[PDB]
Amino acid sequence: SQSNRELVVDFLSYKLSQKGYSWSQMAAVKQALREAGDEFELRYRRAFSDLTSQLHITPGTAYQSFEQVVNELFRDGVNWGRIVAFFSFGGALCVESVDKEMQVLVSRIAAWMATYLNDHLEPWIQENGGWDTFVELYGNN
Amino acid sequence: GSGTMENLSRRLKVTGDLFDIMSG
């Protein structure tokens, strides 16, 4: 049963990360990204007001808002920190979408994010050491 | 409005940038 397999894998990964170990390189990247997001959001709220509700998201304007914010973010450059900002932005978009009962946007926001990573961030990422470098730099924080 | 976006991008860029610099 894949369901059970995925469960065992998720659980074991969580337990390994709690000790500074990792189930796989993908797992360590995930754990690093989650932690960097928490830290980034913490440092964001202590300086500003929630990145979540500010923009008025609607199914019809969501994409455009995502694109405007995201293009200005990497207009003059890409770096790990901005990527974390990006991930955290997408995350707040989804949280806001669910709060406002536009649950269907979450899978779209998800797609728009992977697409933007695959197309516009991957090049820089490969060129700068891949995600393993990201893990060295933001791992276990 | 739309001015909210410029402002959000800016706050995200500085926050990230500071975050990047503090890991070097």
Swiss-Prot record, chain A:
Changing G91E: No heterodimerization with BAX. GO terms for biological process: apoptotic mitochondrial changes; apoptotic process in bone marrow cell; cellular response to alkaloid; cellular response to amino acid stimulus; cellular response to gamma radiation; defense response to virus; dendritic cell apoptotic process; dendritic cell proliferation. Keywords: Apoptosis, Cytoplasm, Cytoplasmic vesicle, Cytoskeleton, Endocytosis, Membrane, Mitochondrion, Mitochondrion inner membrane, Mitochondrion outer membrane, Nucleus, Phosphoprotein, Synapse, Transmembrane, Transmembrane helix, Ubl conjugation. Proteolytically cleaved by caspases during apoptosis. The cleaved protein, lacking the BH4 motif, has pro-apoptotic activity. It comes from the Eukaryota. A motif (BH1) lies at residues 72-91. GO terms for cellular component: Bcl-2 family protein complex; centrosome; cytoplasm; cytosol; endoplasmic reticulum; mitochondrial inner membrane; mitochondrial matrix; mitochondrial outer membrane. The keyword Plastid does not apply. A motif (BH2) lies at residues 123-138. A motif (BH4) lies at residues 3-23. Changing D132A: No effect on caspase-1 cleavage. Bcl-X(S) is expressed at high levels in cells that undergo a high rate of turnover, such as developing lymphocytes. In contrast, Bcl-X(L) is found in tissues containing long-lived postmitotic cells, such as adult brain. GO terms for molecular function: BH3 domain binding; channel activity; identical protein binding; protein kinase binding. A motif (BH3) lies at residues 29-43. Changing D99A: No effect on caspase-1 cleavage. Belongs to the Bcl-2 family. Homodimer. Interacts with BCL2L11. Interacts with BAD. Interacts with PGAM5. Interacts with HEBP2. Interacts with p53/TP53 and BBC3; interaction with BBC3 disrupts the interaction with p53/TP53. Interacts with ATP5F1A and ATP5F1B; the interactions mediate the association of isoform Bcl-X(L) with the mitochondrial membrane ATP synthase F(1)F(0) ATP synthase. Interacts with VDAC1. Interacts with BCL2L11 (via BH3). Interacts with RNF183. Interacts with GIMAP3/IAN4 and GIMAP5/IAN5. Potent inhibitor of cell death. Inhibits activation of caspases. Appears to regulate cell death by blocking the voltage-dependent anion channel (VDAC) by binding to it and preventing the release of the caspase activator, CYC1, from the mitochondrial membrane. Also acts as a regulator of G2 checkpoint and progression to cytokinesis during mitosis. The BH4 motif is required for anti-apoptotic activity. The BH1 and BH2 motifs are required for both heterodimerization with other Bcl-2 family members and for repression of cell death. This is Bcl-2-like protein 1. It comes from Homo sapiens (Human).
UniProtKB/Swiss-Prot annotation, chain B:
The modification Phosphothreonine is found at T15. This is Beclin-1. A motif (BH3) lies at residues 4-23. Plays a central role in autophagy. Acts as a core subunit of the PI3K complex that mediates formation of phosphatidylinositol 3-phosphate; different complex forms are believed to play a role in multiple membrane trafficking pathways: PI3KC3-C1 is involved in initiation of autophagosomes and PI3KC3-C2 in maturation of autophagosomes and endocytosis. Involved in regulation of degradative endocytic trafficking and required for the abscission step in cytokinesis, probably in the context of PI3KC3-C2. Essential for the formation of PI3KC3-C2 but not PI3KC3-C1 PI3K complex forms. Beclin-1-C 35 kDa localized to mitochondria can promote apoptosis; it induces the mitochondrial translocation of BAX and the release of proapoptotic factors. The chain holds residues 107 to 128 of 450 of the full protein. Ubiquitous. Belongs to the beclin family. It is found in: Cytoplasm; Golgi apparatus, trans-Golgi network membrane; Endosome membrane; Endoplasmic reticulum membrane. A homodimeric form is proposed to exist; this metastable form readily transits to ATG14- or UVRAG-containing complexes with BECN1:UVRAG being more stable than BECN1:ATG14. Component of the PI3K (PI3KC3/PI3K-III/class III phosphatidylinositol 3-kinase) complex the core of which is composed of the catalytic subunit PIK3C3, the regulatory subunit PIK3R4 and BECN1 associating with additional regulatory/auxiliary subunits to form alternative complex forms. (Microbial infection) Interacts with human cytomegalovirus/HHV-5 protein TRS1. Phosphorylation at Thr-15 by DAPK1 reduces its interaction with BCL2 and BCL2L1 and promotes induction of autophagy. In response to autophagic stimuli, phosphorylated at serine residues by AMPK in an ATG14-dependent manner, and this phosphorylation is critical for maximally efficient autophagy. Expanded poly-Gln tracts inhibit ATXN3-BECN1 interaction, decrease BECN1 levels and impair starvation-induced autophagy. The coiled coil domain can form antiparallel homodimers and mediates dimerization with the coiled coil domains of ATG14 or UVRAG involved in the formation of PI3K complexes. Changing L12A: Decreases interaction with BCL2L1 isoform Bcl-X(L).
